């Protein structure tokens, strides 16, 4: 899958 | 799946 | 599935 | 999968 | 997979 | 604050 | 703050 | 802050 | 801060 | 800061 944190 | 936090 | 928090 | 943190 | 931290 | 996704 | 994804 | 992805 | 990916 | 990827 695709897992992300964008800050 | 696709899991994300965007801040 | 698709799971997200957008802030 | 693809896993990332972008700051 | 692809794993990254970009700062 | 505190922001989380737990799966 | 504290930001997390736990899978 | 503290930012994490745990898989 | 503290930033991590644990797999 | 402290930045890490653990696999």
Curated annotation (Swiss-Prot), chains A, B, C, D, E, F, G, H, I, J:
It is found in: Cytoplasm; Nucleus. It comes from the Eukaryota. Such modification might only occur in extreme conditions and additional experimental evidence is required. Palmitoylation helps nuclear targeting and decreases catalytic activity. Belongs to the Cu-Zn superoxide dismutase family. It is linked to Amyotrophic lateral sclerosis 1: A neurodegenerative disorder affecting upper motor neurons in the brain and lower motor neurons in the brain stem and spinal cord, resulting in fatal paralysis. Sensory abnormalities are absent. The pathologic hallmarks of the disease include pallor of the corticospinal tract due to loss of motor neurons, presence of ubiquitin-positive inclusions within surviving motor neurons, and deposition of pathologic aggregates. The etiology of amyotrophic lateral sclerosis is likely to be multifactorial, involving both genetic and environmental factors. Destroys radicals which are normally produced within the cells and which are toxic to biological systems. The protein (both wild-type and ALS1 variants) has a tendency to form fibrillar aggregates in the absence of the intramolecular disulfide bond or of bound zinc ions. These aggregates may have cytotoxic effects. Zinc binding promotes dimerization and stabilizes the native form. Homodimer; non-disulfide-linked. Heterodimer with SOD1. The heterodimer CCS:SOD1 interacts with SLC31A1; this heterotrimer is Cu(1+)-mediated and its maintenance is regulated through SOD1 activation. Interacts with DAOA; the interaction is direct. This is Superoxide dismutase [Cu-Zn]. It comes from Homo sapiens. The gene is SOD1. The chain holds residues 148 to 154 of 154 of the full protein.
